[PDB]
Amino acid sequence: RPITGAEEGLFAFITLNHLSRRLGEDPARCMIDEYGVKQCRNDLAGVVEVGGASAQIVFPLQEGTVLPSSVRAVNLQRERLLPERYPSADVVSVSFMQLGMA
Amino acid sequence: EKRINVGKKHLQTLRNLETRCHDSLQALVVIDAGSSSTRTNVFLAKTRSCPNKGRSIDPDSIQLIGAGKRFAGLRVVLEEWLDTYAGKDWESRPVDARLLFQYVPQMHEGAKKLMQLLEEDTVAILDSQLNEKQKVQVKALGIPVMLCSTAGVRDFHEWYRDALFVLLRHLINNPSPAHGYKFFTNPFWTRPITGAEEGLFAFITLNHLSRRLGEDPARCMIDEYGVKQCRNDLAGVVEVGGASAQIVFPLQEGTVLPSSVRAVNLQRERLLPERYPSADVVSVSFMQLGMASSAGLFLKELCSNDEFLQGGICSNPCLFKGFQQSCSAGEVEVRPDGSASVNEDVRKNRLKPLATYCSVNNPEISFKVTNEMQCRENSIDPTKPLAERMKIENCSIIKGTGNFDKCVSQVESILVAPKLPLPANIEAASSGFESVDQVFRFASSTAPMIVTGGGMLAAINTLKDHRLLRSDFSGDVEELAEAAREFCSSEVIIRTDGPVIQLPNARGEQKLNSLNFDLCKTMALTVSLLRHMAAGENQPSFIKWEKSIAGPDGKPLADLGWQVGVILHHVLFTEEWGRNAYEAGYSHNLE
Amino acid sequence: ADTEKRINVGKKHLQTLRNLETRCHDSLQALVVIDAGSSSTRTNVFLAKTRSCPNKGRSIDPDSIQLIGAGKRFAGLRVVLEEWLDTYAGKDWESRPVDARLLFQYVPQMHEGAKKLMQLLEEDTVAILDSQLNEKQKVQVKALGIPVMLCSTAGVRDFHEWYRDALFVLLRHLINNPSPAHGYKFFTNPFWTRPITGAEEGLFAFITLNHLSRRLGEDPARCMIDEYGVKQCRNDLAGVVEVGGASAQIVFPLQEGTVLPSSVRAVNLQRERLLPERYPSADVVSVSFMQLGMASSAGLFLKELCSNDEFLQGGICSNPCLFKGFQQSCSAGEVEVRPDGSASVNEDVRKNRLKPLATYCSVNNPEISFKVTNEMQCRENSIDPTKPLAERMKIENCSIIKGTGNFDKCVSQVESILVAPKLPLPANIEAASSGFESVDQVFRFASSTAPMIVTGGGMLAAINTLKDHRLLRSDFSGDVEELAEAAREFCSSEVIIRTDGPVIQLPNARGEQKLNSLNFDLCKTMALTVSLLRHMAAGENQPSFIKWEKSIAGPDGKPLADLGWQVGVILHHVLFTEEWGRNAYEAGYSHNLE
Ligand SMILES: [Cl-]
């Protein structure tokens, strides 16, 4: 099937993290939230990819950050990109056709 | 021998009692913390306790039993607290918010007096509406309270509102033990809601009460994989409130919006559970179309236009011939003598919400690059200090000209189809359109539309009371324009008993007051909205003006608005509701 | 300068309030377990800590469960049914076949019978709550509601009509309608209040033991990897031997890698919905022996011993399990030792210790009827199913029983009559039972290395009597020969009549103790102990240790609750978080609103 620039960014983010051994069932840190619920995450690295047609920037949302209402973290489990057994991954995902090489 | 059957039947009766579901009455309270007032809303619901299945609410049973007195708005609590501890010029000068942490008990002090008035009013409603048997059930189950703030408390941009909500929930969770009503809340039920969220909840209220929203779908489509894709036959809502206007309607079947705007999916937003057919909607909320902001913005743009402003006189076509006032967007008070009194206080300026929104102090303006330009180009300059930002230059008097068609053409250019709209940042509950014109030109639907809001209904009822519009009026644009043109050509006559609106050809009159002097602008907004809806590729199957919905019997079940929808979004998620309302319950407050 | 102090106080105050609305809140709850046994109905009052968490509902902390009070012994449920059947089914209802269909005319009279007992239990439960709780505790207890679990063990199992089911419907109705004056909101449902079998009683007593001793928990003690590469986990659970008044239960963990015969099965506590899935898997050998109860073994022992040519001679039964100088009328009736040293035997059919086994061993019992061998298995245990009741229990050609105090002969007869009979009584194959028929079969095919806890009033008195006369060392750890030598000496005692009453006088002037209705036949319990230990010692796998326990010490040293089925019953409900939350809190006492 065809894939968009933003989807190409998320897939490149998954590639980087898999090969770097950052993505996996073992989280790098678990935090006890306001309710006493253990929230676990991998120590994911962000990616800056400047391709021929577009530039993608994908990185995990800063822990305890409140984004403007007008933008949103992309949840990889919600988008069916990562299974539920993987620690929750919330990312800032951006694709700019104007920053591509061409 | 027939004595055996009495015994066998008695045992079966008792066996039926311990195996079947049992019904019990529950009260639920929604506190509407609006811009100008805070009002309690008391509801009744039938709960069902089923062996090994817990306890749930029958959503069809939700009924309003009483709406109370309008107490002061939450904004008053904060404004009085800021006046005392930050200094009287906090609206017009920089404030060190950190220093205000010294005065948290004084903020609690302000919230306590208001909560005590609401608690007494709620108890008064319960006692007057319930019989002794109903009271026993109601007192036993506990009373969930959902206090939601809407407009008036969104523009402080510090720690105040969140701290105020912590204090309000603490107050709700400590009711007086004397009356026996076990009120209780949690941070999921008592919280601020946005304008677009009020829209979604009003949409859910309308469809629930009219019986259009239900588990059983109206129609299904079979996809390429043989899977049923089902939907309900939902009605849209147009709500013009005092602080904002919302438009929410189902996305036209078989359409997809481009990557610049988005349909809101009620299930994805966790407003409706997955067992309800998928509901995709076009959702918009515009502060500038609320009754108060639209009045201020209309004057700000009309009175800076060379066609209307000449030699310090602003000729306003939406105001009656014979009416005049001083030139400012200040709150107008129609006096006993017939003159208009304009309040010049920054706090009472109709432009205050838009000017506070269109500011460099507002982080929302920095969220999107064009925001500041869209403010400036609509005559609300973020670079100008507050008083200069709201001022109408080279203008001493506003005089009414009673020209309905000119009023409509100006509502078109300032409010409905502006060349450059004011900024509206998208949020999870909204579609991203910034203008009503764009909504109907690009995302029109065949779904029926219900027009709601106090002022919208007052505009139609005024024309029907004067017998200028037929009682069976059903939305015809030209019939409405004709009625409104005649009413708006009325002359203001000052008499011994006060000012009157005298209809042409001695066809009646009514008293002129602070609430109706500018009603022609609402009639013009209605004509303009109907015109845009009629010019859409898809037109609503019908259009109606409503305040409430009749139940299966004929009596009103509840009022239109966001309140029923707020309850439903909690009660419909069965497992979560059972845990919070019954397992934790009021007993969570035990010390 | 001190402005920062006032700022930080304001900030802290808001953080204190925010924490208060995001964290779990604790609250006390009372729980009631009504123990409806064979000869009595008694209330048991418990306290537990509940935890209410945002978006999570409310649950009980299982380690907080504590007994606050046990009530008075009121009449047994069998007494309620017999008084109702004595009034409306006339006389000889248990002699002549009765038309049960006609008894439906007398349902309000059954209700009145049950109302009298329930009012007594409700008053007693309220008395315990009022004496044990302070005012702050009462507010919490009254607001949450009081779950009541009434379970009947032995007594009411044998009517074979609609009576028991009807009684239970009436009992729950009474429990669900408590007096509003006291403010205690008692309530029940058909899942909490119901009869329980002997095998289910064993599983509940096994759960109680392992809970109190901190062996049962979510975290496993050890994990293993099977043939497929799957991690298999378990707790290090202790087995229980509970010798009750009506039956004996043996419940212990299945030894790792055991291949059981096709005809018996391990009981899986998770599959049986006794423990949730979050607990490590627990597979057990579960056995309930009808003839090994204090009452039933006493009856059967006399029936078999006193029909054997070696012991019955010219109307005199020489009993090796009774003291020299002791004598009684020849019947299985309840015995009362009187101040002059004489024995009074109650001849009432309802007080005959052979009655439950004789009604069990009937052609009218489907358990017996459905299998050809079953009827013969009863007959070989001296209880003939074709015989009428009173004749079925009679010890023929026998006038008196005289004690001979010969421990070795007592062990030999206990072994051949009770523990390893020529023909065992029929196997029970209900879900809670592994389907074993004898003690030897259990230790031959399913022996385990799990430690074993011996419980039951009579089992403990058998060991403590020997320790008290310094015949057994205080450090006794289960050695068979050490026990047999001690019991041989004690069991050789002579009954002597003094001014103060009858005494058991030990040989070689070692001392004495008062002879009474509870200890006159204790030597048979000493012989049952020797026999049980011998069968366990002959197993391929040996328990790591064997201990006799009256109670289990809590974290603070003092016991939190009693051994027995009561704690286990609470746990099998409270551990199922979602189900408990729905029944106890969502439905609750408000389900009773009318
Ligand atoms: Cl737009």
Characterise the protein shown here.
This is part of a larger assembly, with 3 copies of chain A. Chain A is of the alpha+beta class and 102 residues long. Chain A is built from 1 helix and 6 strands, in the order H-E-E-E-E-E-E. Chain A has one helix at residues 5-19, and strands at residues 29-32, 38-41, 47-50, 55-60, 74-75, 90-96. In chain A, the strands form 2 sheets. A 4-stranded antiparallel sheet of chain A has the order 3-4-6-5, with helices on one face. In chain A, a hairpin with a 5-residue loop joins strand 1 (29-32) and strand 2 (38-41). The longest helix of chain A has 15 residues, at 5-19. Chain A is globular, with a radius of gyration of 14 Å. The two termini of chain A are 23 Å apart. Bound molecules: chloride ion (CL). Chloride ion (CL) is lined by residues 421, 433-435, 438 of chain B. It is classed as hydrolase. Keywords: hydrolase, ntpdase.
Q: Outline of this structure?
A:
The structure is cut from a larger assembly and holds three copies of chain A. Chain A contains one helix and six strands, in the order αββββββ.
* Strand order in space, largest sheet of chain A: 3-4-6-5
Q: What's the assembly state of these chains?
A: part of a larger assembly
Report the count of strand segments of chain A.
Answer: 6
Order of helices and strands of chain A: HEEEEEE
Distance N terminus to C terminus of chain A? 23 Å
* Beta-strand fraction estimate of chain A: 25-35%
- Small molecules (ligands, ions, cofactors) in the structure: chloride ion
* Rg of chain A (C-alpha, Å): 14 Å
